Amino acid sequence: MSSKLNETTEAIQRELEETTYQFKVQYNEQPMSAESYLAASLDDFKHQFH
Amino acid sequence: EFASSFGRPQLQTLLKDALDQKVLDQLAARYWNRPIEDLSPAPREPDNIIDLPKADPDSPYWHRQLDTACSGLTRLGVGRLAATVAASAIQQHVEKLLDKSSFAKHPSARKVISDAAATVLADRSYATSDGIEISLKPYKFDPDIQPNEWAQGREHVVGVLQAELEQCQAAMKALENSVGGRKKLKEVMSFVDKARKGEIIVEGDHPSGAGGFSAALLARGREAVFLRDRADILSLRIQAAKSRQCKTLTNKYYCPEVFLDAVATKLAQTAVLFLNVEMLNDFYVRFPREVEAKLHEHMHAGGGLEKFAREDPKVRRHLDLIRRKELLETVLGKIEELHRISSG
Amino acid sequence: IIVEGDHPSGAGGFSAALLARGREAVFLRDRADILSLRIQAAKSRQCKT
């Protein structure tokens, strides 16, 4: 296990990196949560209703 | 001299070409016709490209289509595309300069030089890509198009599109002459159109003979129909790009060709500026030191100095002549030393 | 020309059915010619005796 640990660790760092790059180019690293989405859309609806 | 020659508009043309084919791919995949494989009716999409000039301006289909086309073009690795294109270009130009240089022979020294250029570009590549994506961050959100940019895209789209059409028509006519008569291929085309509509059914995954046409002739007929539809679409989009309605910028959703070409040109140019500064100047500054260090270390560490001399024909004759002369001189020196050590 | 098929589906642009129709047409042609030739022979002077 300890011997495979180095190769596995570097590979995990790799798959983390490409996930991070797509997070940078397509969403501009913008944070998102379900609660944030709901609240923003509710206020959009309330602007529409007003 | 090369560094004085290369500059930045060259990088502009280089990036604009990669992004040109990016535009054709995105536009064709979002708007034009898909290939025919079998002889079943294709699922008919409600909106068609032939009715685009006469379409409701607030069309959710066309709006969503041009918008997902543009967002797909922008949210691509344009930073990494520019960095790798400029890298391969600079390395290639260094290789050509090497071809014309005094290092045509000596593949060891030549490869040392080439590898030096490669390692410098590799070192700077990341900073250039990330900096380009940051500098393009505002144009990803709103690539607002100015009327002159719209005009430039207008002039470019006609050429890009007509080149695509000429290849298409030449392939169609060659198909006709290969299959035989124009009228015969027109017959197979009529049959494939019939099977594509409800008029006739064949029930085959591999139809051998229907209406008297071979398994190969059916394939040629489907290919002919695809070429036909794509040719008509292409000519129509060319006449539309030359249309009066596409001269103005306000019909952006009505002229996807011109708009997408404008976005391509813009992203290419602003990415090109940061590319030139962050990467090109860094190359001009680091490359000579790296060449000198690596060549000197190579000659003296590897003993490739003497082999570098042995490699060229003229210099081999020159240095060989000098060596035999050297041996004879040293022999005479040994004799003269002998006379000195022993008086008589 | 060669076709390399034990059952040829499409050759020169002709269907598996159209090939069958063409073979049938050639058989009928040759048999028609043979038949008319044997009629000309049965009416010939050499068959009178």
Residue B110's closest CA among B282, B279, B284, B298? B298
* Record: contact B77-A25, CB cut-off 8 A: yes
Residues 30-69 of B with CB under 8 A from C: none
Contacts of B220 in chain C (CB under 8 A): 13
Distance between CA atoms of C15 and B215, rounded to whole angstroms?
6
Nearest CB to C14 within list B207, B212, B219:
B212
Query: At B225, which amino acid appears?
Result: V
B212 interfacial to chain C (CB closer than 8 Å) = yes
- Exposed (0-12), middle (13-18) or buried (19+): which is B293, by Cβ within 10 Å? exposed
C5 interfacial to chain B (CB closer than 8 Å) = no
Distance between CA atoms of B8 and B132, rounded to whole angstroms?
15
**Min Cα–Cα distance to chain C from B221, Å:** 10
Residue B32's closest CA among B262, B261, B235, B243? B235
Distance between CA atoms of B168 and B176, rounded to whole angstroms?
13
Nearest CB to C9 within list B188, B208, B220:
B208
Closest-CA residue in chain B for A23? B75
Query: At B36, which amino acid appears?
Result: I
Question: b/e string for B229-256 if b means 16 or more Cβ within 10 A?
Answer: bbbebbeebbebbeeeebeebeebbbbb
Question: At what angle are helices B304-311 and B313-341 packed, to 10 degrees?
Answer: 120
Mutation choice for A interface testing from B73, B126, B129, B133 by most A CBs within 10 A: B133
Closest-CA residue in chain A for B72? A26
Contacts of C6 in chain B (CB under 8 A): none
Mutation choice for B interface testing from C3, C4, C6, C9 by most B CBs within 10 A: C9
Q: Record the tokens describing residue B9, joined without a space.
A: 């508009």
User: Are C and A close enough to touch, i.e. 3+ CB pairs under 8 angstroms?
Assistant: no
Distance between CA atoms of B33 and B35, rounded to whole angstroms?
7
Angle (CA) B194-B195-B199 rounded to 5° is 55
**Min Cα–Cα distance to chain C from B185, Å:** 10
Distance between CA atoms of B133 and B264, rounded to whole angstroms?
14
CB B252 within 8 A of CB B145: yes
Mutation choice for B interface testing from C6, C7, C18 by most B CBs within 10 A: C18
**Min Cα–Cα distance to chain B from C10, Å:** 3
Mutation choice for B interface testing from A17, A20, A25 by most B CBs within 10 A: A25
| CA distances in angstroms from B26 to B154, B211, B257, B265, listed in the order given | 17, 38, 10, 15
* Record: contact B133-A26, CB cut-off 8 A: no
- CA atoms within 13 Å, Cβ hemisphere of B186: 3
CB B216 within 8 A of CB C13: yes
User: Are C and B close enough to touch, i.e. 3+ CB pairs under 8 angstroms?
Assistant: yes
Distance between CA atoms of B242 and B155, rounded to whole angstroms?
9
Distance between CA atoms of B272 and C47, rounded to whole angstroms?
98
Distance between CA atoms of B257 and B146, rounded to whole angstroms?
16
Contacts of B77 in chain A (CB under 8 A): 21, 25
User: Are A and B close enough to touch, i.e. 3+ CB pairs under 8 angstroms?
Assistant: yes
* Record: contact C18-B218, CB cut-off 8 A: no
Other Cβ atoms closer than 10 A to B2 = 12
